[PDB]
Design a protein around this ligand. Structure first.
Ligand SMILES: C[C@H](O)C(=O)Nc1cc(Cl)cc(Cl)c1
Ligand SMILES: C[C@H](O)C(=O)Nc1cc(Cl)cc(Cl)c1
Ligand code: NA
Ligand code: NA
Lengths: 301, 301
């Protein structure tokens, strides 16, 4: 029993974290095979950040301008190239701890573990979701750029996020491991603000199914709803629209509990209307939206 | 910025989990050098659990009765003994990934990371606190026994917990790595229950400091109080007494924010008496007590 925000075991990722230094800037790189992946703003000064010309800054760099340190060992950089907003440094040594891995770009609402690191050494691991506004609500201090997010389904690490920056509202923006930002952000010091955040409706529903599975039914009711009537109510609470895709994804959890999806949607509608009236659901006094249907199935009975 | 429930990187502990089977019971073991540590109830059958005589049940066992699996490799048991409620299995192979480590016993209110495992395979990591009633609010399913809790100090893994059982309220109970239970529990199938719990006051105050560091300040006020006055309030709301030692531990946070501990106690007093009036603190509608002062400091530096 119990239900916890659970991250993936981070060991396979720890073995890939290295330190990248350019001039006075130091941040984290991801060492996979003979390539080290890191944010390209490692090559900027603060004066460069307002309008950086990355091709121009990079063409002035030699391989020996990049210091890559893996634990105690210096790695020798033998090549470098830029792909979108990540720098790819070729090193002379393949990472002997390289796991089975792949790069995956994820959709808003998906969750992943974050291995926060500073100076190439891991600091902690925690669970995150990609918000509908393409930010993440993480915990990053200065020096954490290059920290990566990942899932480990079976023995393959699927890398899905690398950290680049904090927006003024305290949320965080990054790229996939091909260097493409999530959302409309740029590796540039401009007036860019995240769109208004919404609640991941499908995840709240999965987490309500999780509450039933662990034996709590107090929030159900005798009512149902059409899909469109549910969405008309949910947008009024800044909930994300629920699509037929989301209805399909919830099917297995519906069958395990015996509660049809739209009946669970009626219960969520009443929770939004009533609040919780002093009770809790899986130990939380708010409706939790950072557990996916997949996450619930992995953790629950 | 940001504040998340954060676990230690679990790699150093992942390399120590093995599968241990005795008959039809299979659970997890902790493999350090040439000894595997696991709960002693692995040797019991279902009817044995009703009233086990572990000394007699172990005399009837011999080395070959213990199948130990380090991934795909079989470890050969060359000896077996008991320390309190954990079974120590001598093996023929020293673990080559044995990290620097200590066995420590933690105090109620202290936090640690749990690496949940099933069949010797790590499946997830999360952060836990030893509750004042000596239980932990974990997330475990059948087969998780032998999962370990740990802190990492510098390079050293401090093992503090081994999972043994779940209680009827869905919370969890276990031993230290020397086999001594946390709390008044026994490794036997009998009627056991968690006692009434209390809130860890020093941890709530630390979390309130974490909220101020992250720009959440609406609960601060002009007032101060005394240890004696506040502890009267603390007793009323089922909060642990705040001691002079707790005020000292909160020293580093009281300076960084320029907010005296008794100054902050006035804020918590008001939150306890009046509630939160629809607002949240670090995204929570209840007062979080599973962050120690150190947890706050380490994450905010
Ligand atoms: C939110 C603001 O626009 C910002 O944080 N910009 C920035 C982006 C990168 Cl990728 C690196 C640095 Cl140092 C600053
Ligand atoms: C709460 C109940 O008394 C219980 O969970 N008893 C138990 C203890 C251990 Cl250590 C192992 C098993 Cl299988 C059952
Ligand atoms: Na490193
Ligand atoms: Na005050």
């Amino acid at each position: 029993s119990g239900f916890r925000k659970m991250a993936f075991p981070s060991g396979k990722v720890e073995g890939c974290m290295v330190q990248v230094t350019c001039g006075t800037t130091t941040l984290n790189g991801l060492w996979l095979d003979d390539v080290v992946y890191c944010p390209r703003h490692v090559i900027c000064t603060s004066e460069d950040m307002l309008n950086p010309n990355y091709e121009d800054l990079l063409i002035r760099k030699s391989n020996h301008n990049f210091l890559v340190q893996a634990g105690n060992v210096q790695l020798r950089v033998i090549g470098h190239s830029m792909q979108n907003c990540v720098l790819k440094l070729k090193v002379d040594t393949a990472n002997p701890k390289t796991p089975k891995y792949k790069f995956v770009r994820i959709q808003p609402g998906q969750t992943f573990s974050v291995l926060a690191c500073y100076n190439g050494s891991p600091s902690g691991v925690y669970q995150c979701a990609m918000r509908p506004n393409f930010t993440i609500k993480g915990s990053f201090l200065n020096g954490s750029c290059g920290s990566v997010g990942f899932n480990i389904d079976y023995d393959c690490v699927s890398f899905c996020y690398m950290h680049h920056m904090e927006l003024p509202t305290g949320v965080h923006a990054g790229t996939d491991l091909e260097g493409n930002f999530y959302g409309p952000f740029v590796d540039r010091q401009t007036a860019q603000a995240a769109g208004t955040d919404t609640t991941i409706t499908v995840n709240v529903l999965a987490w309500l199914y999780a509450a039933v599975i662990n034996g709590d039914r107090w929030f159900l009711n005798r009512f149902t709803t059409t899909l469109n009537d549910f969405n008309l109510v949910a947008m009024k609470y800044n909930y994300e629209p629920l699509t037929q895709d989301h209805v399909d994804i919830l099917g297995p959890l519906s069958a395990q509990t015996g509660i049809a999806v739209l009946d669970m949607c009626a219960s969520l509608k009443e929770l939004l209307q009533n609040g919780m009236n002093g009770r809790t659901i899986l130990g939380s006094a708010l409706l939790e939206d950072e557990f996916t249907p997949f996450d619930v199935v992995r953790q629950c009975s």
